[PDB]
Design a protein around this ligand. Structure first.
Ligand SMILES: *[C@@H]1O[C@H](CO[C@@H]2O[C@@H](C)[C@@H](O)[C@@H](O)[C@@H]2O)[C@@H](O[C@@H]2O[C@H](CO)[C@@H](O)[C@H](O)[C@H]2NC(C)=O)[C@H](O)[C@H]1NC(C)=O
Ligand SMILES: *[C@@H]1O[C@H](CO[C@@H]2O[C@@H](C)[C@@H](O)[C@@H](O)[C@@H]2O)[C@@H](O[C@@H]2O[C@H](CO)[C@@H](O)[C@H](O)[C@H]2NC(C)=O)[C@H](O)[C@H]1NC(C)=O
Ligand SMILES: *[C@@H]1O[C@H](CO[C@@H]2O[C@@H](C)[C@@H](O)[C@@H](O)[C@@H]2O)[C@@H](O[C@@H]2O[C@H](CO)[C@@H](O)[C@H](O)[C@H]2NC(C)=O)[C@H](O)[C@H]1NC(C)=O
Ligand SMILES: NC(=O)c1cc[n+](COC[n+]2ccccc2/C=N/O)cc1
Ligand SMILES: NC(=O)c1cc[n+](COC[n+]2ccccc2/C=N\O)cc1
Ligand SMILES: *[C@@H]1O[C@H](CO)[C@@H](O)[C@H](O)[C@H]1NC(C)=O
Ligand SMILES: *[P@](C)(=O)/N=C(\C)N(CC)CC
Ligand SMILES: *[P@](C)(=O)/N=C(\C)N(CC)CC
Lengths: 528, 533
């Protein structure tokens, strides 16, 4: 047999598989159990470490995807199917994967740990677009990705109860991070140089590990792509978490917190998934029902509170956004929008869409948004309205939260690097008016264009190797630059670079004007 | 005697003078009494019409300036002395002036009626910059200007009182308009073609005559320069007027606070005029700029509702309006209180001084409202640039008080039937005394409207003289026909949608869009809703 493909971790022995890349072989260990299956009486509970096993665990294929909603809006359309589960669904789903150079490294190797996004209601470490084979071959890293529970299974909260305490999906991730500390050395990885990176809800979870002391000792650097823990969508208060969990029980026919969760545990997993979206208070976009809860435990305060109160010297983070963060979300509830036309909306549809994009704010607050995003010399132009509503959803949910994190961390000791990803892939199936949509920098950071089975151009391949080197340079040293320089982001200069096929261009300000509204003014308005 | 210099009006006979102008003789009748002198027991009362006289009244020089405060900030400096009284102060001051071509016209000719500004606390029709001889000579119109009471004398109000009903300074204006209607035909003017035009507080007053029905029958067209009735400074509520009137009285001895209105006004009437003037600004509640102690009050009489509400409910079909502003409306006001500002340095303020100036520029608003102002006028990529902050604060003062009020008026009047024309005056005069950073400051289009550069004793360039002749022709064309275009790039009507206006400077007309539409949307559409919640 191949001795490179057999590893002993603390729980027992594993057998991996060898994989081809256009640059050479890679060792992969897929489907490693890191937790006891959170099933039956273990539903909603914090994860238990996987008990040791005898024999050899088969680690040659991906394990199951945690139970989650499956999108049906454009069935068969690649733009939507690429995020849908590609393995069967199961509550037995707490498995992580390790990619490693072939032969396995002899010296400690920097570790990248990937946390997928999916609004905390979906996602899987087994998606084609999170394939780690290209990064570990091109950049000689160890890549780890784990599955964590999503939707109600990971984030249903009855705050105060021990039978449904909340944030257990976050605890799944932390447990995998503890698994890396105890076991990644057996694969050649260096546990003293772990770099977290994630996108969207994955980027939010990275930030929440930055702000939870128990997790902070498990990694050393962080990359947050198109997400932040301080969004309007990434956390929920205790009282709202309790209301949503209670309405879920009523929707599925149940029923004392003990009697409520006991009844929920009798229900097939598909039943809860089928109802999770209907506990949201308002019709909205970019809002998810079961997200992390601020109960003083995992997060002792709100992310913004912890961000402003934090000393962040000794931290290096890489943060960024795509050029058009909002367009993707508009075809999922904004009236007048669809990927199959130009979506040139009326002002009425624009006004309606602002309530959908900024749900559960006062009429005055909504009118303040309309004032900022209206061009009062062209108040009714359909094309400008389309691009303005996408600016609303994108700035409110991604750009401005990212900008606040970058500015606060920078001014409070951290070295920050910011990017805007401005390249529209030649393969992109979405219409042209959506620009560079949310999520579509991931395929380049993982080096998917190097797969010769796809039709990326030669320059997109070179571009992918540029990005993989930036990311891996940051993992290795905390500086993405090769030793046109990428300057650190600071609260004053607000400098970032644009990532596309032409060389690095340094620009100033992550929509400083629009984000002054969201980050500085709008909070004060909601207080009064 | 010269027969052209003798006219009979209703009151009796007048004798005027023949003025020499650069272009030829003009007959002037200066100092025509139109009301009984508002003295002693007539202080604070509405004007009563001038009773008939026997013999010939010599209307041969400007009469006195209505008692008012005199600016002392930059003594001897032309930029401020030009606005100060150039006649003796007196409460006996209700006189008007008539300029007419020499010889008098035999068929009726259109009439322009000027209403000076001065924040309702100052101003006079006698100021050199309001000389009507050039307009009359160059464009063949009858020009009328009047004095009206200012300060407490014009606008101290104890609403509901008989002894001080308020708005008497506006009634001074209305009485003069009534005078024009009955008497201008004797000077050759056409009482069926009367165009009101004023600047700043004068522009605000012109608008209040548009919105008060009893005045609306006395003119046909209006020109509003750098002012509007709906500004945050041109009116005041009944209770605040009462509060200021009562504290003014308290500060000067009356009564020996509040109580009975007749007894209180009777006591105020025994106080010398200068004593009242010397305490007028002590009643303003906060440190501010572009705010004035005694202004028109909204008491349901002269104005049945606020100018905003009246503008919204108005049917303005059959009305032609000419409105506009200067390029840098707010700079002039910053050297009168804004921390760090001076006409003698470049006033490159700090950010702290910017934030402090915002409170001075927008007084008596919630902290939230002040943060909203700071949000829209900060450049969050250059938040502490001294020059950018200096221009931003001037934009705050200008947009808040002038530009956006004018814009809201222009847009609502256009949408509700009126043909509106709008300008931005963008020429900095070669003779200007203010520093360069102030740009084209508030009030400095007037001299070109009145054709002052044609005075040979002045030192304007030749091109500025042609510019003066162009603007006078615009204003006179609008007065005659309601259209400033000569019967040459055309001047399009302002509409709420297209929002077109023209720029006035030494270059030919340039059409533009939007009177600071982004800024004004904040002032006219958002902030009103913030202040209610
Ligand atoms: C563009 O299309 C959208 C969405 O319409 C859908 O996609 C179209 C391509 C076509 O397949 C339709 O049959 C689909 O319904 C339009 O937005 C909708 O417009 C209809 C009225 O025609 C309205 O009843 C819906 O409420 C709108 N969408 C939603 C979800 O409310 C939009 O009007 C189209 N704009 C164009 C054609 O310019
Ligand atoms: C408020 O006071 C006025 C004026 O009072 C007069 O003058 C005072 C100094 C003192 O001499 C009083 O006695 C005087 O009456 C009142 O107006 C007068 O009211 C009386 C009684 O009705 C009447 O005979 C007088 O003619 C009025 N004089 C006027 C109108 O000038 C007024 O009634 C008082 N109102 C109150 C107390 O609310
Ligand atoms: C610019 O000048 C202003 C006003 O100062 C006046 O003008 C000067 C040229 C000089 O003639 C002074 O004597 C005048 O008083 C300055 O603002 C003042 O600054 C002083 C000193 O710091 C302070 O005590 C006053 O309170 C300030 N007054 C106001 C109204 O703010 C300003 O600091 C100068 N800025 C410069 C020079 O850049
Ligand atoms: N009656 C008063 O005491 C008084 C005091 C101050 N002001 C305002 O004057 C300051 N000011 C402020 C801005 C522009 C001009 C001027 C001066 N004009 O004469 C008016 C009345
Ligand atoms: N549990 C939920 O809140 C939820 C949210 C969204 N969706 C799917 O519909 C929204 N949607 C559909 C397609 C793509 C994106 C999105 C929204 N956010 O990502 C299902 C369940
Ligand atoms: C691009 O790739 C897809 C999937 O491999 C393939 O089906 C398609 O044929 C390629 N391009 C074209 C135009 O053939
Ligand atoms: P974020 C809102 O967590 N990301 C989502 C919803 N993605 C799917 C389009 C990217 C993984
Ligand atoms: P407005 C505020 O009435 N105008 C003023 C105070 N001026 C003085 C320069 C212009 C006449």
């Amino acid at each position: 047999e191949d001795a490179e493909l057999l590893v002993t971790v603390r729980g027992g022995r594993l057998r991996g598989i060898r994989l081809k890349t256009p640059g050479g072989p890679v060792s992969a260990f897929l489907g490693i159990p890191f937790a006891e299956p959170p099933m039956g009486p273990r539903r909603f509970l914090p994860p238990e470490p996987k008990q040791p096993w005898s024999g050899v665990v088969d680690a040659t294929t991906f394990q199951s995807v945690c139970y989650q909603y499956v999108d049906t809006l454009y069935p068969g359309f690649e733009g939507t199917e690429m995020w849908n589960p590609n393995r069967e669904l199961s509550e037995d789903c707490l498995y992580l994967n390790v990619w490693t150079p072939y032969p396995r490294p002899t010296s400690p190797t920097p570790v990248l740990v990937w946390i997928y996004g999916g609004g905390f209601y979906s996602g899987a470490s087994s998606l084609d677009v999170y394939d780690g084979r290209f990064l570990v071959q091109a950049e000689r890293t160890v890549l780890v990705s784990m599955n964590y529970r999503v939707g109600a299974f990971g984030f249903l909260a009855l705050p105060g109860s021990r039978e449904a305490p909340g944030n257990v999906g976050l605890l799944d991730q932390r447990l995998a991070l503890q698994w890396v500390q105890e076991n990644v050395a057996a694969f050649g990885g260096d546990p003293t140089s772990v770099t977290l990176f994630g996108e969207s809800a994955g980027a939010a979870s990275v930030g929440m590990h930055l702000l939870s002391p128990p997790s902070r000792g498990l990694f050393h650097r962080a990359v947050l792509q198109s997400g932040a823990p301080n969004g309007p969508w990434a956390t929920v208060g205790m009282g709202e978490a309790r209301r949503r969990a209670t309405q879920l029980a009523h929707l599925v026919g149940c029923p004392n917190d003990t009697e409520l969760v006991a009844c929920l545990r009798t229900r097939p997993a598909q039943v809860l998934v089928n109802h999770e979206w209907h506990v949201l208070p308002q019709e909205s976009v970019f809002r998810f029902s079961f997200v992390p809860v601020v109960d003083g435990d995992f997060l002792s305060d709100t992310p913004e509170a912890l961000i402003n109160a934090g000393d962040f010297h000794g931290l290096q983070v890489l943060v960024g956004v795509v050029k058009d963060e909002g367009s993707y979300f508009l075809v999922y509830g904004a009236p007048g929008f669809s990927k199959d036309n130009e979506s040139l909306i009326s002002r009425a549809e624009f006004l309606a869409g602002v309530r959908v994009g900024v749900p559960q704010v006062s009429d005055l607050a909504a009118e303040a948004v309309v004032l900022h995003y209206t061009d009062w010399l062209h108040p009714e132009d359909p094309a400008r309205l389309r691009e303005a509503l996408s600016d609303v959803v994108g700035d409110h949910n991604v750009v401005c939260p990212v900008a606040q994190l970058a500015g606060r961390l920078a001014a409070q000791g951290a070295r920050v690097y910011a990017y805007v990803f401005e390249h529209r892939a030649s393969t992109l199936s979405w219409p042209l008016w959506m620009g560079v949509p949310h999520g579509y920098e991931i395929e380049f950071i993982f080096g998917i264009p190097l797969d010769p089975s796809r039709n990326y151009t030669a320059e997109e391949k070179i571009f992918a190797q540029r990005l993989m080197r930036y990311w891996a340079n940051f993992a290795r040293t905390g500086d993405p630059n090769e030793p046109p320089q990428w300057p650190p982001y600071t609260a004053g200069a607000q400098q970032y670079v644009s990532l596309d096929l032409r060389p690095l261009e340094v620009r100033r300000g992550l929509r400083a004007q629009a984000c002054a509204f969201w980050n500085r003014f709008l909070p004060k308005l909601l207080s009064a």
